[PDB]
Amino acid sequence: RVKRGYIARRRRKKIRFFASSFRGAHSRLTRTIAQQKIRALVSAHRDRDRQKRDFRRLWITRINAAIRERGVYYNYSKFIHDLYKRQLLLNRKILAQIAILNPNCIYMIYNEIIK
Amino acid sequence: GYKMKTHKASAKRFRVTGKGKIVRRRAGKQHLLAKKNTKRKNRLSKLIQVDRSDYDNVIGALPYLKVNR
Amino acid sequence: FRLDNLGPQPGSRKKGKRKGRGHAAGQGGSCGFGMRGQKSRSGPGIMRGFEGGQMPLYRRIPKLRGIAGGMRAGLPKYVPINLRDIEVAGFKEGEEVSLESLKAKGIINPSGRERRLPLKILGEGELSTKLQIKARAFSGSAKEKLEAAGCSVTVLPGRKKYIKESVRKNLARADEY
RNA sequence: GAGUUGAAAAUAAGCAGAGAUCCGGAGAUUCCCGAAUAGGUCAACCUUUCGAACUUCUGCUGAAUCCAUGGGCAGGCAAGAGACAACCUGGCGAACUGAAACAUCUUAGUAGCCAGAGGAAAAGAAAGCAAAAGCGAUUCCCGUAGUAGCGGCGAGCGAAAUGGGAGCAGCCUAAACCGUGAAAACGGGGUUGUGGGAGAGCAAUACAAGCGUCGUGCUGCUAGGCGAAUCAGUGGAGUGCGGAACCCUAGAUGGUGAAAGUCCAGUAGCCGAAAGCAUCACUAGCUUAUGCUCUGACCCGAGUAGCAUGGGGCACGUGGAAUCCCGUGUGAAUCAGCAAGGACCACCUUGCAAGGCUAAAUACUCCUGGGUGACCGAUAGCGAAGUAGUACCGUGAGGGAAGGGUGAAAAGAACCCCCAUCGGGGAGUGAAAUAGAACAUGAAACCGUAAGCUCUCAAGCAGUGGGAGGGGGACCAGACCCUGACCGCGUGCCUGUUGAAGAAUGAGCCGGCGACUCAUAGGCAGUGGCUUGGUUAAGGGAACCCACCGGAGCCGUAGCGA
RNA sequence: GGCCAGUGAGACGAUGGGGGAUAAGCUUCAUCGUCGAGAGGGAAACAGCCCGGAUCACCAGCUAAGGCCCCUAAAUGACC
RNA sequence: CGGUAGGGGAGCGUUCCGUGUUAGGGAGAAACGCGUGCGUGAGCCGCGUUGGACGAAGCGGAAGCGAGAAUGUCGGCUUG
Known part of the structure; x- marks a missing residue:
């Protein structure tokens, strides 16, 4: 009742196709294709939460x-x-965006914060 | 095929009582009886329930005797 | 019902859980047996009833009495039949009560011993409908119930023991009124 | 009934419609080795007075020894030897293991070794079970029953009787007695059990059945024979598809360029044996043979049973230890008796040891002939789809591989060029030549070549988030894909630890093979079927499964106490 | 209670002690916190220390521990 | 609504079988490779100037049923 199969090659070919542009045996060699799928996905996790954190930092300093x-x-x-104090509820640091896309308008923002 | 064998070393020690509970004879009776008390020798002369630990141990070690719980 | 549209009810047949097929399945890796020990290794393992080198449960307890002596155990010598088995039965006013009546009616179903233990009628429950019982001996309370019902009661002598002619002579000498 | 001289083509000669090749029955040959056998042998050889050597049978001659025995000679289609996978019987007979050590015990009278023998073997016709009621040889299955027991009462071991089925079959012999012979034998008689037989006497005849070279009988088998019913269109080919018809006592199967009721071989059905084998039914024939009365004399298996010991095996480990069989030694009775009924005694019941033979049910596959398969598909299935127990390894015992698929048909590439070949390109065959003999689909690791972007002041588990610059097609032109200037962040995966990036373990990589499975039981849970309680096992069945029987048994109905 | 598992090598930190030399990231206990089985932030890095308990998404906001010269987000903030 | 050892519930996939001489298929099945698609995911569906004959789904069943580890093992091919 022999059970030779092909499902490891589709299982494995999907992970093979995700691991493109990994510079060498991280893009060709199956027993590292797995752990680069894994480490690439957790890299996506922590860099997603810290892209929220990191763009917060970037707009603060901008x-x-x-x-x-x-x-x-x-x-x-x-x-x-x-x-x-002058009641402007939550401009959400998108004045750091129109601070460069509209510098006269952020001069109107700040020059009405003064008054 | 292979029937399970009743463990004889515990079939001679344990017993079912109609409702379906294992009873047992208490230990310390056929040895050094003057040294004890008559209070002990009729405390150790009665048959009691076995406690739940060794009521569920030997329930699978003695399969053919119809004990519930 | 076609051959197509048949399907079992849910809960009737669960799937057998396969072990060591992935940790998301539930019992992957060590297949649900921890890390090491006799519980994880393959083989007969542990005798059930063994206390790990301690003197076991059954050895510390003295043997049951007639089973300690090797005496033959207590054994039923009759078929215990109450009168509750007789009232709930469909026996009407004119009816004999014997072995084949209680077998052929649906009260007793004796299989392992058709040859040894005849019958006995016990006391609990009433019997208002009178009958004609030719069965084996009775208890005192069941004799009070059946003679309290006005029914024909007949004890049946089953077997005659062999008495030696000097024992039958010594017992026949005892007839001194 | 039409072509043949194997695979296996070619060539040379044949053999054959007074019937070849081939198939089947019965025969013939069968060099040499191997039981190997005339003798030797280092197997397939040597020497030979050419021989079945040796054992057994028959016959003659017949030593020490009179009869014998041994030997020698001879005859003999001449009985045995040797081989055989598994089952079976008989004998020797373990140990690892389990008991969480280990010696009693278990594993286990299993494996192994030797001997023997048949399609079956062993056993088998009551000196038996049982219990006051009864059965009637042995074997096997379901059950009792995991019960009674046995056991450092540990681990474990584990019946039997009652009941239900398969299959049935019972017969010869010794002794007492007559007859012949110095016994030893021979021929008649008798072989049985709520007793017979022998001795004496009276009756009485034929019903039924058993055995069997021999040949007519039957079916079956080993060769075979007849055997229904369609074309056309389609991209290589049609059996598929679409259109028109039919067979079916035949739509099982295999093949045919491609999947078939109508193409072939066949099948259903009807037929068919000179010769051999088998199945039961005839036959010349041999046989079994009968009943009563009296009679305790005579007989009913002797170095046997029993006993004292030493044990073995019955589930029973020496225990109250019976039944059964042996070692040493003692050593009975015949029916008015003896043995068994779990020490033993008394009574009763049952049977008649010390003599043999028997088919069936039953267990297995080196196989054979049919039918199947929720069996495999070239790392699988037999080790083995070719030289397979082969190549190879070992002195030897022994170990032991690997390698399948061009097409439908070799139609296997005429000819030209490179050229010593191998190979390559045209051309030709083919539907396909990127199907070219390393030849069917051809994936990954691995090695490459071409195109786009980009790296030579750069520190990095090689990613990811943002994305400079650039390239490509585009249509929801804001989108998608590829490259990556630079910045932040990020201590391979598993195992396994208090704690692993760990400089703890493992893996060179890629692809396959590779692990809680099966049988039978206990327990519980979930879904059912009946609750006039439930349910059958073995077994029977249109080959299997199965409808329907088959109530044996099991479980729950009553407990307490040793 | 029924069925049915693992675990029975712990580690550090505070307090209460014994062994030590009131030496050890030492050893053994008793209550508790964390890790084990816990990610994130602060601690330069760094299981057990502080905040804190991660279902997931957002190029959202407010905070705890802790910080506001630059590397690196926020004060070269004010007054003693 | 973090989670190791572990426990429970629900599902995907594979080959064979019933429906099944199933639908479909030399007007290209399985394979192999592909995705601007859908799912919690195992995966499905769709497209292929490659390949050439088988074989879905649904409703069900049974496993030699799922691979990254065993100094595993068998072939192929690297490094030096």
Whole structure:
């Protein structure tokens, strides 16, 4: 009742096709194709949570570098002082996006934070 | 085919009592009886239930005797 | 019903769990036997009733009494039949009660001993309908029930023992009124 | 009834419609070795007075020894030797193991070794079971029953009787008695059991059955024979598809370029044996043979049973240890008796040891002939799909591989060129030549070549998130795929540990093979079927499964106590 | 209770002690926390220390422990 | 709604079998390779100038049923 099969080769060929552009025996050699599928997926996990964290960090330092161009000592903390006292609910650090896509509009943002 | 064999060394020690519970004779009776008390010698003269641990151990080691639980 | 559309009910046939076919299946790897020991190794393993070198459960307990002596165990010598087996039966007012009546009616189904233990009628339960019993001997309370019902009661002498002629002579000498 | 001289083509000669080749029955030959056999032998050879040597049978002559015995000579189609996978019987007969050690025990009277023998063998016709009721040789199956027991009462071992089926079959011999002979024998009689037989006397005749070279009988087998019913179109080929018809007592199977009720071989059915074998039924014939009365004399298997010991085996390990068989030694009775009924005694019941032979049910496959397969498909299935127990290894015992598939048909490439070949390119065959003899689908590791992007100030389990620059096709042109300037982050996988990136283990890589499975039981859970309680086992069955029987048994109905 | 598993080598940290030399990431106990079986953040890295308990997605916001010169997110913030 | 040893529930796949001489298939089945598709995933479905004859689904059953480990093992091919 012999049971020679082919399902390991489709099982294995799917993982073989996912492991393209892995520079060498991480892209050809099955017994490393498996663990590069595995380590590639957990790399996708931690780099996804830390792409949320990392783009948060990037917008913080980008709008900090935008506000510090005034010359007078107005930090990023004081922009949030007078960004929540003057009631602006949650611009979500997308003013770090229109701070470079619309620099006159972020000058209107900050020049209305002053008043 | 192969029938299971009743373990004779425990069939001579354990017994079912109609409702289906293993009873047993207490130990320490056929040896050094003057040294004990009559209170002990009729405490150790009665047949009691076996406790649940060795009520579920020998229930599969003595298969043909109709014990529930 | 066609050959196509037949299917068992759910819960009737579970799938047998296969062991060592993946850790997502449930019992992969060591197949559900821990790490090491006699429980994981292949073979007969452990005798059931063995306490690991300790003197076991059965050896520390003294033997049951007649089984300790090798005396022949207590054995039923009759068929115990209550009157509750007789009222619930469909025996009407005119009916004989014997071995083949209780076999052919559906009360007793004796198979292992058709030859040795005849019958006995016991006391618990009532018997209002009168009958004509020619069976084997009775208890005192069942004799009170059956004679309290006004039914024909007849004991049946089964077998006659062989008495030696000097024992039959010594017993026949004892007839001194 | 039409072509043949094997695979296995070619060539040379034949043999054959007064019937070849081939098939079947019965015969003939069968060199040499091997029981091997005239003698030797280092098997397939040597020497030979050419021989079945030796044992057994028959016959003659007949030593020490008179009869004998031994020997010698001779005859003999002449009985045995040797081989045989498994089952069977008989004898020697373990140990690893289990008991969580180990000696009693178990494994186990199993394996192995030797001997023997048949399709079966052993056993087998009551000196038996049983229990006051009864059965009637042995064997096997279901059951009792994992019960009674046995056992460092440990591990374990484990009946038997009652019951239900398969299959049935019972017969010869010794003794007492007559007759012949110095016994030893021979011929008649008798072989049985709620007793017979011998001795004496009275009756009485034929019913039934058993055995069997011999040949007419029957069916079956070993060769075979007749045997129904369609074309056309389709991309190589049609049996598939679409259109038109038919057979069926035949639609099982195998093949045919491709899958077939109608193409072939066949099948269903009907037939057929000179010769041999087998099945039961005839036959010249041999045989079995009968009943009563009296009679305790005479007989009913002797170095035997029993006993004292030493044991073995019955499930029973020496225990109260019976039954059965042996070693040493003692050593009975005949029926008014003896043996058994689990020490033993008394009574009763049962049977008649010390003499043999028997078919069936039954177990197995080196096989043979049919039919099958939720069996395999070239690492599988037999070790073996070719030289397979082969090549090869070992002195030897012994160990032991691997290698399948071009096409439908070799139609296997005429001829030209390179050229010493091997090979290659045209051409030709083919549906396919990228199906070319390393030849069918051809995947991964591995080795390459071409195209796009990109690396030579760079530290990295080689990824991933973001994405500079660039390339490609595009249609939902914002999308998709490929490359990757640079930044952040990220201590291979398994095993297994308190703790593994670990400098603990494992793996060179790729692909296959490779592990909680099977039988029978106990327990529980889930789904059912009946609850006029449930359910059958063995066994019977249109080959198997199966409808339907088959109530034996099992479980639950009553417990307590040793 | 029924059926049915593993586990029975623990480790460190605080307290209570014994052995030691109040020496050990030492040994043995008693209560507790973590790891084991726990990811993330802080601890430069780093099982057991602090915050904290990961179903998953978001190029969302507010915080705990801890930090706000640069590498590296946020104060070269204010006053003693 | 983290999870090791472990326990339970629900499913995918493979070859064979019933339906099955099934639907479909030299107008290209299985294979092998492919995806701008769908799933929690095991996987399904679809496309192939490769290949050439078998064989789905659904409703069910049975396993020599699923591979990355055994200094596994058998072939092929590397490194040096």
